[PDB]
Amino acid sequence: WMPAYACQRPTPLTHHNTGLSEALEILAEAAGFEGSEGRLLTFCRAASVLKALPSPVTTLSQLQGLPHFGEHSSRVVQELLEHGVCEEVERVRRSERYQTMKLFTQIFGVGVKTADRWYREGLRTLDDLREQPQKLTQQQKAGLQHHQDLSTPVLRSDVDALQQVVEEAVGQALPGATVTLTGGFRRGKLQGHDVDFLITHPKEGQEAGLLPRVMCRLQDQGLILYHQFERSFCIFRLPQPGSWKAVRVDLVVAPVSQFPFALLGWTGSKLFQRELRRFSRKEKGLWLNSHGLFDPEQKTFFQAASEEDIFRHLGLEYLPPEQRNA
DNA sequence: CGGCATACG
DNA sequence: CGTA
DNA sequence: GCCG
Ligand SMILES: Nc1nc2c([nH]c(=O)n2[C@H]2C[C@H](O)[C@@H](COP(=O)(O)OP(=O)(O)OP(=O)(O)O)O2)c(=O)[nH]1
Ligand SMILES: [Mn+2]
Ligand SMILES: [Mn+2]
Ligand SMILES: [Mn+2]
Ligand SMILES: [Mn+2]
Ligand SMILES: [Mn+2]
Ligand SMILES: [Mn+2]
Ligand SMILES: [Mn+2]
Ligand SMILES: [Mn+2]
Ligand code: NA
């Protein structure tokens, strides 16, 4: 059948129900904009279920028995199957509230709470925000200045270039340290909104203090347009033909003992990790995050040398990153 | 009905 | 509050 | 919104 947790089934990047999943994810997004995290989760999970199916849904009957499809999500699918559009979805798409909250929350440094307050205050455009910078954090000023570049898809060419310069700085910061590409590109995506890198060292403990040294070295190369420890949310200056563009890059450091858990978490998808942690706690009684896996009965952490170890600890069939596109 | 992942900056 |  |  179809299991109820996304981490129990392979989900490929491309699939056979793209239009149906896209529509449900509009409703999930809108639910988030209104603070309804429960409805967001259900709509996300229902969309993910369709991603995992082996063929296109053609008839409403094919939804019977599928987890996370109830009256609401099935009606969305029925309208799409019958009319090619779902009236609720189209109403969301063209609502001023949805459009403005999408524009605002996609600014680096702006979340749902900030976007909602700005919306209530009457603000609607990026130029509205730029007219009174005094109301902005340093992070939001950077997100607004570079917003256009940050809206341009990051390509694989860009990733190769960025990894080499990151490796150069990491190599000077700490000989022997390694750089691993994570995030959506590791799941096989050809584009991204940013690049994610996970940094470690084979000798436990030697990675301590590493990220400041890396950042200082990238800074003195003039590559850091913005940055603010274990996680650095940066904007890199990336060369382009006769120019350059700003690119969001995340750098994260973990000791080798935690590296499998950090690799798993930063490789995503977001829904996959939420479902994996939910499964861990509620089905296995184990607590999972990007640092480790904790047995609260025996008060001990599971040692893992690989992602494969973690799936085994959780009694789940192993899924390569390419099949974690929940 | 309660739950809905779980961290760091 | 923001970030992943 | 859906599940157990
Ligand atoms: N954006 C985000 N990522 C999260 C969260 N929680 C969590 O574990 N992650 C993990 C799973 C994500 O796939 C991974 C990388 O984050 P990301 O925003 O760069 O997403 P991504 O690489 O998959 O896709 P892209 O939008 O960057 O192209 O971090 C969260 O709340 N937000
Ligand atoms: Mn409804
Ligand atoms: Mn009809
Ligand atoms: Mn990413
Ligand atoms: Mn993104
Ligand atoms: Mn830590
Ligand atoms: Mn990222
Ligand atoms: Mn309730
Ligand atoms: Mn509800
Ligand atoms: Na944002």
Q: How many residues appear in chain A?
A: 326
Query: A11, A52 in Cβ contact below 8 A?
Result: yes
- Quote the ligand 9 centre to A293 CA distance (angstroms): 31
A267 CB neighbour count, 10 Å cutoff:
23
- Give me the phi and psi of A43, to 5 degrees please: -65, -40
Q: How many domains does chain A have?
A: 4
A73 and A106 share one domain? no
In three-state form (DSSP H/G/I as H, E/B as E, the rest C), the secondary structure along chain A is CCCCCHHHCCECCCCCCHHHHHHHHHHHHHHHHCCCHHHHHHHHHHHHHHHCCCCCCCCHHHHCCCCCCCHHHHHHHHHHHHHCCCHHHHHHHCCHHHHHHHHHHCCCCCCHHHHHHHHHCCCCCHHHHHCCHHHCCHHHHHHHHCHHHHCCCEEHHHHHHHHHHHHHHHHHHCCCCEEEECHHHHCCCCEECEEEEEEECCCCCCCCCHHHHHHHHHHHCCCEEECCCCEEEEEEEEEECCEEEEEEEEEEECCCCCHHHHHHHHHCCHHHHHHHHHHHHHHHCCEECCCCEEECCCCEECCCCCHHHHHHHCCCCCCCHHHECC
**Taking a C-beta distance cutoff of 8 angstroms, is the pair A21, A40 a contact?**
no
The residue out of A256, A289, A317 marking a domain boundary is A256
Residue A64: which domain range? Answer: 1-95
Nearest to A285 by CA among A293, A312, A275: A293
**Is strand B in 7 Å reach of the CB of A229?**
yes
Ligand 1 atom closest to Cα of residue A272: 11
Same domain, A10 and A82: yes
Token pair in block for residue A44: 């996300």
How far apart CA A75 and CA A78 sit, in angstroms, is 5
Give the number of other Cβ atoms within 10 Å of residue A70's Cβ. 11
Do strands A243-253 and A194-200 pair parallel, antiparallel, or not at all (unpaired)?
parallel
Indicate if CB(A38) is under 7 A from strand B. yes
Co-location of A247 and A157 in the same domain: yes
| Torsions phi, psi for A299 (to 5 deg) | 65, 50
A290: tokens are 């990007």
Closest CA to A290 of A311, A315, A266: A266
| CB half-sphere exposure, A40, CA atoms < 13 A | 12
**A252, A326, A236, A242: which is closest to A291 by C-alpha?**
A252
Residues A129 and A178 in one domain: no
Q: Do the Cβ atoms of A291 and A263 come closer than 8 Å? A: no
Report, in angstroms and rounded to the nearest whole number, the Rg of chain A calculated over CA atoms.
21
| Among candidate residues A141, A251, A144, the one with its CA nearest the CA of residue A194 | A251
- Strand C atom within 7 Å of A12 CB: no
Q: How far is the CA of A287 from the C1' of B6 (A)?
A: 9
Which residues hold their Cβ within 5 A of ligand 4, which is an ion? A 183-184, 192, 194, 196
Resolution in A: 1.9
- Kindly give the interhelix angle for A71-83 and A18-33, rounded to the nearest 10 degrees: 130
**A29 and A102 belong to one structural domain:** no
In one letter, which amino acid is A237? R
Q: Is the domain of A72 the same as that of A37?
A: yes
For residue A157 the two structure tokens come to 């060419």
Token digits of residue A31: 């639910």
Q: Is the CB of A97 under 7 A from strand C?
A: no
A196 annotated as belonging to a binding site for a ligand = yes
Same domain, A251 and A262: no
With tokens 């910078």, the residue in question is A133
- Choosing from A27, A62, A95, the residue where a domain stops is A95
- The residues facing A192 across adjacent strands are A154
Same domain, A43 and A54: yes
Q: Residue A267 Cα, ligand 7 centroid: separation in angstroms? A: 10
Residue type, A187: R
Using CB atoms within 10 Å of the CB of residue A145, give its burial: 0 to 12 exposed, 13 to 18 middle, 19+ buried.
middle
Domain boundary among A95, A115, A140: A95
The bridge status of strand A287-288 relative to strand A178-181 is unpaired
**Cβ within 8 Å of residue A297, ≥6 positions away:** A285
Tokens of A11: 């989900």
Q: Which of A292, A211, A231, A293 is nearest to A258 (CA)?
A: A292
Q: Which nucleotides on chain C have any atom < 7 A from a protein Cβ?
A: 1-4
Instruction: Give whole-number Cα distances, A236 to A53, A74, A223, A248, in Å.
Output: 38, 43, 6, 6
Which of A's residues 141-180 have CB atoms within 7 A of nucleic strand C?
143
> Cβ(A158) to ligand 1 under 6 A?
no
Contact A46, A24 (CB under 8 A): yes
What span, in angstroms and rounded, lies between the C-alpha atoms of A151 and A196? 16
Nearest alpha-carbon partner for A23 in A66, A65, A83: A83
Residues 6+ apart with CB under 8 A from A149: A245, A246, A247
Per the entry, the structure determination technique was X-ray
